[PDB]
Amino acid sequence: GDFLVHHAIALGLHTTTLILVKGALDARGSKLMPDKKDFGYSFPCDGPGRGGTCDISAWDAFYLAVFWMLNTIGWVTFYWHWKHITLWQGNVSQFNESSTYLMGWLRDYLWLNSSQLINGYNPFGMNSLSVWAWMFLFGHLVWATGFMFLISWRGYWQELIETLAWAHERTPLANLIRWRDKPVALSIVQARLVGLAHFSVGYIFTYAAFLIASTSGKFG
Amino acid sequence: ELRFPRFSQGLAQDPTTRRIWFGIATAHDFESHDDITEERLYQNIFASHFGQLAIIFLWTSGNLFHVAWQGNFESWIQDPLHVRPIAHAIWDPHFGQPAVEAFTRGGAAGPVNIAYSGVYQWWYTIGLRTNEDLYTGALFLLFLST
């Protein structure tokens, strides 16, 4: 089991490096745009021409990189926790057999060890673990809000604001209040940054809740 | 200039709300500030660093203060393997009654949080032994932050 996981760890480091190293060396320029240096580290894109240039700034190379970092560190901490959580119980056979097929990781680590966490509060009562049960879902909620900014891009929301900024300008008793700063949808880069902020926060809080509750539930 | 942000004129005249969002993300990027010079670039960084040390020392004076005002540090020493280390106390006025009971543990009198940062063992090893060592430990770091 420890053989196969280590390559999965090794896969993360190269692929994570590949994005970052590809970002660094092509920062000054490349064939798709050989004067990328004239725009800075972070710029949105370069327009639809030449076949479309979405996600070309060296910034975006850092952007995609973080996803592979969280996945990679996901595969590392997962491995450390399960190997130790079987050891501390003196049940070392369970890891050494289940850890060779994926359903073993999904059944015997995720599904099995979260039995005490999700009962933090039920229609029967609550426990000390309730706060970790709440944060657990709170992790799922922020993470799922992250997708909203990564998938849905700006031009849609901008047309949505304009209708809204018309409705507010015609409603009686509410045309007496006027924005000082005009309302516009977030910029293209901002959405990526904002979208990644949610994804990371939700990804840390979710795992951090499961890690503490499941272990402290048994204290062993 | 003429308004927030003071360090970027191009953003200042942006009328939309874009200015506010972008006046926060580009605060610390000292190169792209307007009218920057290589002497300022370093002198801001040097002053900013001391700001980051102030936070680190103030942060660590928080831990010592609570562990020695609401914690189990003197009791935990007496049996490290059966006394949950205590991080701080809980006062949340939304709590109902069965939660107040549930979060009362570690030999406290009200709700508490169990400390999982492992400070309790580290300070045991490096020689701290009562609450009082911790209080002066708090004051000193607070002074270093000042």
Partner: peptide
């Protein structure tokens, strides 16, 4: 005792004065 005073102050008052202080500074014009 002391938490019952300091928790609201940092939870309710200190936020309110903070938000209202920034809002004027952000929205100034000179």
């Amino acid at each position: 005792n002391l938490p019952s005073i300091f928790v609201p102050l940092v939870g309710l008052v200190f936020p309110a004065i903070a938000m209202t202080s920034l809002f004027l500074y952000v929205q100034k014009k000179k």
